Amino acid sequence: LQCRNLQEFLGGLSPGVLDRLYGHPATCLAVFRELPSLAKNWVMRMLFLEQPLPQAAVALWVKKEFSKAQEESTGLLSGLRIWHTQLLPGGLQGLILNPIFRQNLRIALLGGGKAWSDDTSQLGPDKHARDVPSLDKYAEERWEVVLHFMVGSPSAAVSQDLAQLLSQAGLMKSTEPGEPPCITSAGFQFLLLDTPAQLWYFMLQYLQTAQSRGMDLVEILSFLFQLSFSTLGKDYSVEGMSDSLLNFLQHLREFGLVFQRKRKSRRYYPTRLAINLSSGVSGAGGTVHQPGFIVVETNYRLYAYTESELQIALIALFSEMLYRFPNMVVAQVTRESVQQAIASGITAQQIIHFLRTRAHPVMLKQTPVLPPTITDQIRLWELERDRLRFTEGVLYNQFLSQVDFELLLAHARELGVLVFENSAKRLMVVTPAGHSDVKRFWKRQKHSS
């Protein structure tokens, strides 16, 4: 999963759409934190000055050694529309902070006209208030329910609304009468992926289908920034949220990012998953959500000290399990079991990462246990798949002079129907579907003679 980091989605947006996102004060604070220190300090410097500042002055402030680093940050600011060029009468061109972005940062920094994103009329004690540890358990259970659809367990209690999102996401595909759920190869890789990265990918999929729903993309993004900074101890009010946000909150309950005591309740409790959600892997060798429970051995014996149906299913896909016990689960990384994971569709690096992420503390700091000897064998199996390539290829004959064949090769290469140049053998690798266009070019070559 590419890490947006509040940059990739912002990049390529229309300037007015970026200004609409900058309309919320909370989003501007999140963007300010996202900005690198050199850019962030400069935005603070230009925050108090209305006058545009010339490029020559901008070059002067940074040292010549650090000027190259500043140019990359300046490019990010221009793409985000935080900095917009202003043409001065003099040759030097002034750079001025975006007014909507500047005003909202000023509203967060000092008193402003806006009343803030969240307002509470007067709520203190909450009936059936959710405990912080119970919130953490609820968040883990709800995410397991989303995953468990890709297991077929009775614990998969999706609200059907989540199931429709899963089909739109493509992690789970329903085919045949009765729409029975099936796991896509991408879905198996998604299960292997860490939970914070999984949440971020799901949010991007929600944004893609948000346009069909009609929910505003900027409003959903603003709520996501609030979720990242949300504190379990703090409580937030459902009232003061738009109807699209209320629908998003109901979907958030299915994700487990947000816990609602009641759908119509005017108070909602932030959940651990929302704070955990981020565009990054939780750890290379550690998981914030779960302490490592998998023991990794060069012998290929794996012991799991935590008993969960979802965890057992994930371990089973990469490695078949010889024995099952509640205290410890015995699993072997057989060559056949890894081959079954490849047939389902999985990343070999992801399997190593999954074992390292849940590796036991005794296993950590030991060089041999982290990489199994089977990984060399997995590369050899991948090489066998790489060796054999299948595509349909039409065949052309009587090419005669090589120069005429080369002219056809250039047309075929542009089409992409050509698999190989094959200049000497003079046998076309053009696909049958694209053969008609290549044949038309070949006939034109015959006419030119």
Partner 1 sequence: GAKDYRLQMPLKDDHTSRPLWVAPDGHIFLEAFSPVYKYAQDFLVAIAEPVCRPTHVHEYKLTAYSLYAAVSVGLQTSDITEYLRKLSKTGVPDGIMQFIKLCTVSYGKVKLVLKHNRYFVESCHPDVIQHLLQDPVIRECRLRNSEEETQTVSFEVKQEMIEELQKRCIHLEYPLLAEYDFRNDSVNPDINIDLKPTAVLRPYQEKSLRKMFGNGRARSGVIVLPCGAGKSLVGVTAACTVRKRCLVLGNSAVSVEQWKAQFKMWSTIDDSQICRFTSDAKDKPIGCSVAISTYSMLGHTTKRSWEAERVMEWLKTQEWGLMILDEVHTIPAKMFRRVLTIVQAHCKLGLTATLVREDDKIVDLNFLIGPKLYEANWMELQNNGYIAKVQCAEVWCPMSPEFYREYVAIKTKKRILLYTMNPNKFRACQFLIKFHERRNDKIIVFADNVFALKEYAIRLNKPYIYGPTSQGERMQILQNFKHNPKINTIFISKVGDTSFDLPEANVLIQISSHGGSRRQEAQRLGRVLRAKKGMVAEEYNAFFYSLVSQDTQEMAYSTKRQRFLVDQGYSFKVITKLAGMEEEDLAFSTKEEQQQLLQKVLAATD
Partner 2 sequence: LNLLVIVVDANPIWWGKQALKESQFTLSKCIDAVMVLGNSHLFMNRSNKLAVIASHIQESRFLYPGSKDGKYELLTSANEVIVEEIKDLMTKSDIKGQHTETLLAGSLAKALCYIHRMNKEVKDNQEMKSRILVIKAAEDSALQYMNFMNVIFAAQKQNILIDACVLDSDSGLLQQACDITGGLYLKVPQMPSLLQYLLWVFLPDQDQRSQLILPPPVHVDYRAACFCHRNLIEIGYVCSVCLSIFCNFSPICTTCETAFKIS
Least distance CB 148 / partner 1 (angstroms): 19
Residue-by-residue DSSP string for 321-380: EEEE-SS-EEEE--HHHHHHHHHH---HHHHHHHHHHTB-TTTTT-TTTSS-THHHHHHH
330 binds, among partner 2, partner 1, none (CB under 5 to 8 A by kind): partner 1
Query: What is the Cα–Cα distance from 221 to 277, expressed in whole angstroms?
Result: 13
Q: Which is nearer to partner 2, 115 or 403 (CB)?
A: 115
Does residue 62 belong to the site contacting partner 2 (CB under 8 A)? yes
**C-alpha gyration radius of the chain:** 28
Q: How far is the CB of 296 from partner 1 (least distance, A)?
A: 10
Closest CA to 37 of 69, 2, 79, 64: 69
Range in contact with partner 2 (rule: CB under 8 A) among 31-39, 151-159, 249-257, 392-400:
31-39
Q: Tell me the per-residue interface mask from 312 to 331 with partner 1, x by CB under 8 A, - otherwise.
A: ----x---xxxxxxxxx-x-
The answer to the question of residue 32 lying near partner 2 (CB under 8 A) is yes
Residue 17 binding partner per list partner 2, partner 1, none, with a CB distance cut-off of 5 to 8 Å that depends on partner kind? none
- Tell the residue number behind the tokens 């030097």, with chain if given: 92
- Output the DSSP codes for 163-203: HHHHHHHTSEEE-STT--EEE-HHHHHHHHS-HHHHHHHHH
Please report whether residue 45 would count as binding partner 2 according to CB under 8 A.
yes
Identify any residues that bridge with 84 across adjacent strands, giving them in sequence order: 96
Largest interatomic CA distance in the chain: 90
Tokens of 169: 């996401």
**One character per residue 90-129, x = contact with partner 2 (rule: CB under 8 A):** -----------------xxxxxxxxxx-x-----------
Per-residue binding letters, 291-310, with partner 1 (x by CB under 8 A): ------x-x-x-x-------
Q: Residue from 25, 181, 187, 270 that binds partner 2 (CB under 8 A)?
A: 25
Q: Choosing among partner 2, partner 1, none, which partner's interface includes residue 218 (Cβ < 5 to 8 Å by kind)?
A: none
- What sign does the dihedral 13-255-151-350 (CA atoms) show? positive
Q: What is the distance between the alpha carbons of residues 163 and 181, in angstroms, rounded to a whole number?
A: 9
Structure tokens, 410:
């250039």
Q: List the single partner that 186 binds among partner 1, partner 2, none, CB under 5 to 8 Å by kind.
A: none
Q: How far apart are CA 270 and CA 112, in angstroms?
A: 26
Of the candidate residues 51, 63, 89, 327, the single one contacting partner 2 (CB under 8 A) = 63
CB of 100 to partner 2, least distance (A): 14
Min separation Cβ 327 and partner 2, Å:
33
Q: Could you say whether residue 52 binds partner 2 (CB under 8 A)?
A: no
Task: Count Cα atoms within 13 angstroms, Cβ side, for 1.
Answer: 26
Considering beta carbons, is residue 235 or 320 the nearer one to partner 1?
Answer: 320
Cα(53)–Cα(322) distance, integer angstroms: 69
State which of residues 86, 159, 373, 402 lies at the interface with partner 1 (CB under 8 A). 373
Given the rule CB under 8 A, which residues bind partner 1?
Answer: 297, 299, 301, 303, 316, 320-328, 330, 362, 373, 376, 380
Given the rule CB under 8 A, which residues bind partner 2?
Answer: 25, 29, 32-33, 37-38, 40-41, 44-45, 48, 60-63, 66, 69-70, 107-116, 118
